[PDB]
């Protein structure tokens, strides 16, 4: 009795998963100056629009 592994199919699956991961992980956009997202007072409709 014996057991063994197949390398070609294993490598194909690993390569596809690694391609997906490389397409997802590490790609990030840069945003520098944006609007205020926390407020200490209430002032009306402009702050409401920003929150919305």
């Amino acid at each position: 009795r014996g057991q063994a592994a197949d390398l070609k199919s294993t490598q194909a699956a690993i390569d596809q998963i690694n391609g997906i991961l490389n397409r997802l992980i590490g790609k990030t956009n840069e945003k520098f100056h944006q609007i205020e997202k926390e407020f200490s007072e209430v002032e009306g409709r402009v702050q409401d629009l920003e929150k919305y």
Partner: protein, 52 residues
């Protein structure tokens, strides 16, 4: 700025009023207009004081 006050009061969710005793020396308080008729006599806004 009507919209800001409307939004602020709507978000507050109450009309609770506590009466304070301002000094208001040397003037005539209350004051009534013919446009606001409460019952049969002239009146004014209930929560605002017209100083004359």
């Amino acid at each position: 700025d009507y919209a800001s006050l409307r939004s602020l009061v709507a978000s507050s969710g109450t009309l609770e009023f506590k009466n304070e005793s301002f000094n208001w020396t040397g003037v005539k308080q209350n004051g009534t207009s013919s446009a606001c008729i409460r019952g049969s006599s002239s009146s004014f806004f209930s929560r605002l004081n017209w100083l004359t």
